[PDB]
Swiss-Prot record, chain A:
<keyword id="KW-0808">Transferase</keyword>
<feature type="modified residue" description="N6-(pyridoxal phosphate)lysine">
    <location>
        <position position="285"/>
    </location>
</feature>
<protein>
    <recommendedName>
        <fullName>L-seryl-tRNA(Sec) selenium transferase</fullName>
        <ecNumber>2.9.1.1</ecNumber>
    </recommendedName>
</protein>
<dbReference type="InterPro" id="IPR018319">
    <property type="entry name" value="SelA-like"/>
</dbReference>
<comment type="pathway">
    <text>Aminoacyl-tRNA biosynthesis; selenocysteinyl-tRNA(Sec) biosynthesis; selenocysteinyl-tRNA(Sec) from L-seryl-tRNA(Sec) (bacterial route): step 1/1.</text>
</comment>
<dbReference type="InterPro" id="IPR015424">
    <property type="entry name" value="PyrdxlP-dep_Trfase"/>
</dbReference>
<dbReference type="GO" id="GO:0005737">
    <property type="term" value="C:cytoplasm"/>
</dbReference>
<dbReference type="GO" id="GO:0004125">
    <property type="term" value="F:L-seryl-tRNA(Sec) selenium transferase activity"/>
</dbReference>
<dbReference type="InterPro" id="IPR015421">
    <property type="entry name" value="PyrdxlP-dep_Trfase_major"/>
</dbReference>
<dbReference type="GO" id="GO:0001514">
    <property type="term" value="P:selenocysteine incorporation"/>
</dbReference>
<dbReference type="GO" id="GO:0042802">
    <property type="term" value="F:identical protein binding"/>
</dbReference>
<dbReference type="GO" id="GO:0001717">
    <property type="term" value="P:conversion of seryl-tRNAsec to selenocys-tRNAsec"/>
</dbReference>
<keyword id="KW-0963">Cytoplasm</keyword>
<comment type="function">
    <text>Converts seryl-tRNA(Sec) to selenocysteinyl-tRNA(Sec) required for selenoprotein biosynthesis.</text>
</comment>
<keyword id="KW-0711">Selenium</keyword>
<dbReference type="InterPro" id="IPR004534">
    <property type="entry name" value="SelA_trans"/>
</dbReference>
<keyword id="KW-0648">Protein biosynthesis</keyword>
Length: 452, 395, 91, 91
């Protein structure tokens, strides 16, 4: 059996077989791994044929060269999908980013005075205009935006917050857990389901530095539930002389009813003009932008946050900073259809079917495919609109050979990969999240899975 | 027509860097290779598996994509990455020394950028700061002498944006490790430059410290900016002992620092490059390693372009400048500048007009002689250089 | 009541580490209340009842469940399919 | 020397603010030492002397300069162009 093991070619000849075919460093890493697999499989007497070797060393090389991070075709019909990378970006944006990234830029440079300048300065003008707050600022993501506003304003002093608003969004962000590290002392009023105004007013004192309110972004309570009207927090503040801090979290830039979707989701503009002192929110949710914590409110307060020596550990990168100005530009130009998360949520019911059947039309020929189109009510906003229930057309599919489960699994390993809903051994594809250029990619994906 | 031009344009614009300073704090530090920017463009274009593990079909950690690259290039046990280096320090402190003492050389309490100051951040870090030695000189005894029950951390900062000459003494790195393994205290080096490999391999002879080397010396933790000598997007980079990384990771503040989708991907590509030894493809490595001949080569191809433009006095000089801005304070290398002068207009007014061009160009002034260092200039800029000057001077 | 109240986890989510985390010399009671007249949807996590018991039998702490519904029997046995908790089963 | 040492600013940079910031009831002395046997180049900031004196005349605190080089007269008079301070001028 050592003559069946001596048939394995040495590392140098594999090097020779693929010379310019693939980088020299990968191919050696692909022969060493496949040679330990054939040395162990023939010793244990599990392999009589070595012909799969030439093909297998090539697969490793293809694989060993591939990004862990890859574009993926979202079929779940979830617009803000925390796992799949929240708000994707319009080509215009990406180009504007591409360009600023290909060389040097006036990032920290004021051309007028020919002297360094704050990088936050480029954006803030847009923010002050869209929101109508006195001043504004930007840090890495909303997470740190909370952390900043607490540690700036309330280190060692009391922050009163509703017991119903202490959220855990994502895997490691938790308002109580961070607020602690913030250094602020956390006073929780009311109870889970209910919290009247009196609960806030009642825990105020000399040590009370902040009246915070967090928006329940990724959940919701129904049944006996009360909540305190924003107009009432502000009045309570202006009575005792205490600033109010609202974490919108969704970072909704405008009124959302203007687009035909009727929800109460709060937005910067509207929240500011209500008289709140501070408001925050992520840039990669309902804004439609790249990832960023966005703080707007009273000048005296921003200056304070700016001056805080942690602001420098949160300060945004060149990429998010640029992409964010291009995406705020859009908003001034009422170019809403250009920022993906807005267009996907505001699409015509008609639009949806239209794409639904154009796909159906692409899967008729493919062998063993059971294709039907149904009208379902699903819930589009994952990380910012929990209750939102909107109608959307899904192309439910099923193959007699393979079961729905295996199908998902393979769809996630395709190139590109496709992730989508499962429901009663009926793979589903919500067209809310699907771009048109994918439809061709989908059909070419399926025809290659079932006919191979 | 001029209002239309301005009424349409972004506050942030690309700028042509003639200063010959590769890591230029003001002009946006390390600029990015097209391959990378296309990898970034692709992942931002739609949805992607950022927080999603495809194998298990459940949520996963977005820092998992990269840490494989860092573990291999440095040699450390595990790794992690946060917004920038600023926070990479602030995280290591609040993580490993909240409420306990950190020992650090009085020579190494730095003020880098306008708002960052190790004494001002480390404070907000919650760690108690114990400063040994003196400005100019610091021996090993100074470090050892201030150890005690509260001493959680031995920190050494690299003076990135300054240097001391004259009578000056520094504590050797091998020394601070010995001192650590003696008392059972962890060692934390802020490289800042975030130099990923030995720099002498490319012909530039300096002592700048790098991860691979700093790690195999036995330091427990090492950090650094990604957008400096690494040549990538803005990132705080942390490599070292596994037990420590896991502690940092679990820190609830690490979520307020977790890196964005753009910089995450763009980093994977930048790291992929490094594994493929494609060094010439990462801007800040090629620029600093260009052949002296290569620079003249570019200097006179430009002078050939401006000989026609009216009133232009063009000469090529060979001058010694200091390329590294935010990472290499002492470095001094030879490069060819195309010094220009216009009879009508003076050097100062010239800069001014050049900064207002589209694109704008920023450069050095020395004795009423405008200067263009070619170390930082891209080939496609040369055509745009000539087209912007002839528009200012024949208008 | 005179009891000293120690509130673990967060509104929407609460793991088992949260309970176990706050245990100490003073901790006399592991209590769970059932959300009778409301409910949360979205990203939500709750601590399994089998788990609270394992935890208490670990440190020698009593568990106390306020059903509130006070459902007396298994309700699925009548064709209505819900998870409402009941005395027999909880004990 | 028995004195209590209050170290304001950072290695490379020090503004006036840093000085004024650490003043108090127990502050008996504003001291400036001339860096005689070394020097910093790069990003580097220092407090102009006039500023320290102003700051002294403000709170009523004595200023103390250790020149060290102890240079009696202006050196520029001899053709050497250097900023080295001297007693006369410093007084």
């Amino acid at each position: 059996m050592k003559s069946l093991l001596r048939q394995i070619p040495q590392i140098s000849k594999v090097v020779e077989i693929f010379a310019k075919a693939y980088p020299e460093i990968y191919v050696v890493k692909a022969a060493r791994e496949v040679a330990e697999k054939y040395r162990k499989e023939i010793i244990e007497g599990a392999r009589a044929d070595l012909n799969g070797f030439l093909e297998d060393v090539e697969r490793k090389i293809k694989s060993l060269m591939k990004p862990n991070i890859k574009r993926v075709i979202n079929a779940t019909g979830v617009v803000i999908n925390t796992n799949l990378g929240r708000a994707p970006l319009s080509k215009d944006v990406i180009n504007f980013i591409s360009e600023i990234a290909n060389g040097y830029s006036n990032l920290e440079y004021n051309l007028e005075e020919g002297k360094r300048g704050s990088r936050i300065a480029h954006i803030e003008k847009y923010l002050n205009e869209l929101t109508g707050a006195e001043s504004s600022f930007v840090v890495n993501n909303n997470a740190g935006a909370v952390f900043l506003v607490l540690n700036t304003l309330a280190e060692g002093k009391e922050v009163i917050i509703s017991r119903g608003e202490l959220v855990e969004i994502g895997g490691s962000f938790r308002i109580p857990d961070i607020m602690k590290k913030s250094g602020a002392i956390l006073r929780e009023v009311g109870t889970t389901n209910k919290t009247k105004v009196s609960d806030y007013e009642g825990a105020i004192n000399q040590n009370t530095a902040l009246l915070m309110k967090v928006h329940k972004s990724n959940f919701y309570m129904e049944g006996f539930v009360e909540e305190v009207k924003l107009e009432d927090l502000v009045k309570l503040g202006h009575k005792y002389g205490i600033p109010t801090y609202y974490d919108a979290g969704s970072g909704l830039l405008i009124n959302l009813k203007e687009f035909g979707i009727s929800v109460d989701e709060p937005n910067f503009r509207d929240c500011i003009s209500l008289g709140i002192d501070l408001v925050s929110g992520s840039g990669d949710k309902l804004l439609g932008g790249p990832q960023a914590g966005i703080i707007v409110g009273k000048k005296n307060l921003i200056e304070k946050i700016k001056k805080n020596p942690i602001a420098r550990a949160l300060r945004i990168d060149k990429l998010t900073l640029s992409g964010l100005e291009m995406t705020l530009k859009l908003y001034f130009e009422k170019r809403y259809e250009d920022i993906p998360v807005i267009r996907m949520l505001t699409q015509d019911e008609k639009a949806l079917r239209q794409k639904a059947k154009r796909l159906e039309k692409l899967l008729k020929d493919i062998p063993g495919l059971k294709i039907s189109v149904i009208k379902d009510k699903a819930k589009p906003g994952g990380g910012s609109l929990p209750e939102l229930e909107l109608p959307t057309y899904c192309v439910a599919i099923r193959h007699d050979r393979l079961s729905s489960q295996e199908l998902s699994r393979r769809l996630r390993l395709a190139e590109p990969p496709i992730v989508c809903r499962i429901r009663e051994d009926q793979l589903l594809f919500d067209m809310r999240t699907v771009f048109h250029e994918d439809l061709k990619t989908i059909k070419k994906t399926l025809q290659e899975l079932l006919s191979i």
